[PDB]
Design a protein around this ligand. Structure first.
Ligand SMILES: Nc1ncnc2c1ncn2[C@@H]1O[C@H](CSCC[C@H](N)C(=O)O)[C@@H](O)[C@H]1O
Ligand SMILES: Nc1ncnc2c1ncn2[C@@H]1O[C@H](CSCC[C@H](N)C(=O)O)[C@@H](O)[C@H]1O
Ligand SMILES: COc1cc(O)c2c(c1)C(=O)c1cccc(OC)c1C2=O
Ligand SMILES: [Cl-]
Lengths: 319, 319
């Protein structure tokens, strides 16, 4: 039926996970037609049982079958690259911690504690738990690093970063964004403010420990806040934007870069933000409301098309 | 993208689970258009957060939207029924024990200990572990009971059970098949064999604790083995069928009734059977070979269509 396969949608994610997490997918580099017989002998994977996974991978459209051999689809070439964002997305998606956070989702709806399905399963909010666990922090920050790398060229194209002097990336993580931005735009003061248990060091970047719930450090004519607000409630979102409005002056500008809600694209991400953070995806009009509540006004708006999600580029200044 | 949503296929199964396991789906009985505001009052659930879950279920085609209200789709009416086979499938599908068995599937492909991905995760093979877990055994035995109920009328329609005197259902579970057959076909001796601690009780049925790997008891002219062989290797399947051959005389018959591999339908179940049992889904020809090696021959063959899978009906007799 169409129902039983929709109920069994987990199997798709899990079949891809086995393929990419083991590193079997890395043997399919450069759209090569792999002999599963050869791969079995070399890699030590069972021939019969992996042939059968490959059959299910063709059905999903991850593999293509020609002359009793398999290649990655033109679209699924990224599964050959361990450093691809898709590969890091798979690692987290159906990991033990995410699985148990989803099992509490149903329960999370009934209660009004402000506790995420993740917190109900593990005992601390996502980022407070990523302090303790190295597997989740190293893979999450890697994902945010890879998706940051793909939007660098799109951001530099639509905005002139060469007009600004001091740039602060609020919640940058590894700081990949300003690292890659500094390689095109030189002779600027670069700073990445995050929750740091250990300090990373980048020649051009000035890594600071902070908390944008508490205070944004003033003395910056450009502020960057990319993919943060979707990890927070409307109240917590306004609080962050008000900390900017207190830190900023009239000459200062805030770039609000975030995955935007559109009816065309899937809602699945909106749910995952609920599960992990009690967050949500928002439209431009919804982001503008939270900005007009915090005492900021939209100077400029631009749409960015990433493969995975459309983004909203909003330039915010104080009233 | 098409790729990121294929990677996030688990989110589909997770959203349905939170709807059906919470019993919120049971408020959508008889294709009624539910008011999410009304339900929020009645149930005590979060409106805004559940409104979003319902938006994602519409996208999947589980709910349908009219006048800002939600009904279950024509094919998703079964979610309102907590006795439906789909409602049991959902709960087992992404439960703790299955999830962790999928995380070991990757590893399981390289090793050859005769250990399943479930045995690697939990420390025992599927059915032996169910002896120790009431949540898994009850939900599993319930699922098997609901799918066995659905096939009863088709099996009676194609085969004459009136010609037989003594009938044994091997691996019959709760025994739903012979329970529903004994109500239509009276005056027979009905026996059900399975791995029992506490024996089931039905007035018409003699429930026998046993192990089909060790021995099948003789003295029955009809044997039935439904949805068993797909949980076992070629060798274990041959062993099982050999025990039938030893147990049967010339006038004795065996009904091998099992879901069959047809290219049109998904392979996702073939992977699950590998994860849980090192089992597989087989074509008619493959079933005929294993039987032929056991020393049995095909007498009659018939196709049965169920919504979730096609079935092979193979009447088997000793050479
Ligand atoms: N109070 C806080 N102060 C600083 N950083 C925080 C924070 N709460 C969360 N963060 C960090 O903010 C990041 C959100 S994910 C976004 C990362 C990056 N801006 C990108 O777009 O790719 C995480 O790295 C998280 O650790
Ligand atoms: N060694 C063994 N001997 C007997 N029954 C066994 C067994 N190993 C597993 N089983 C049983 O085999 C069944 C497989 S599920 C199929 C159940 C039933 N025939 C139906 O079609 O609905 C389970 O009920 C399990 O308890
Ligand atoms: C939760 O994961 C599952 C484990 C299972 O063992 C099964 C199923 C799901 C089924 O959906 C299923 C459907 C119809 C007939 C079935 O019996 C062969 C099954 C079955 O066995
Ligand atoms: Cl033989």
């Amino acid at each position: 039926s169409m129902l039983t396969e929709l109920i069994a949608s987990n199997r798709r994610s899990a079949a891809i996970h086995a393929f990419v997490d083991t590193g079997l997918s890395t043997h399919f580099k450069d759209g090569i037609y792999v002999d599963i017989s050869e791969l079995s002998r070399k890699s030590g994977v069972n021939y019969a049982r992996f042939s059968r996974l490959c059959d299910f991978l063709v059905e999903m459209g991850v593999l293509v079958s020609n002359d009793n051999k398999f290649r990655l689809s033109d679209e699924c070439h990224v599964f050959a690259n361990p450093e691809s964002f898709e590969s890091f997305m798979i690692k987290l998606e159906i990991c033990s911690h995410y699985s148990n956070a989803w099992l509490m989702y149903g329960k999370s709806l009934f209660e009004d504690d402000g506790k995420s399905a993740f917190e109900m399963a593990h005992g601390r909010p996502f980022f407070e738990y990523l302090d303790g666990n190295k597997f989740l922090k190293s893979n999450f920050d890697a994902l945010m690093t890879r998706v940051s790398n793909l939007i660098v060229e799109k951001l530099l194209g639509i905005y002139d970063f060469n007009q600004h002097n001091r740039i602060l990336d609020v919640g940058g993580g590894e700081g990949e964004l300003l690292v890659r931005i500094s390689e095109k735009v030189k002779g600027k003061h670069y700073a990445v403010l995050d929750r740091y248990s250990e300090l990373p060091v980048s020649d051009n970047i000035d890594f600071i420990n902070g908390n944008f719930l508490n205070s944004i450090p003033s003395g910056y004519d450009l502020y960057i806040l990319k993919n943060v607000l979707h990890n927070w409630s409307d109240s917590d979102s306004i609080l962050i934007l008000e900390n900017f409005r207190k830190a900023m002056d009239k000459n200062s500008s805030l770039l609000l870069i975030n995955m935007v809600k559109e009816p065309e694209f899937s809602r699945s991400f909106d749910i995952l933000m609920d599960v992990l953070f009690l967050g949500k995806e928002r439209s431009f009009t919804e982001f503008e409301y939270l900005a007009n509540q915090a005492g900021l006004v939209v100077q400029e708006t631009k749409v960015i098309d990433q493969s995975y999600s459309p983004y909203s580029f909003i330039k915010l200044q104080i009233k």
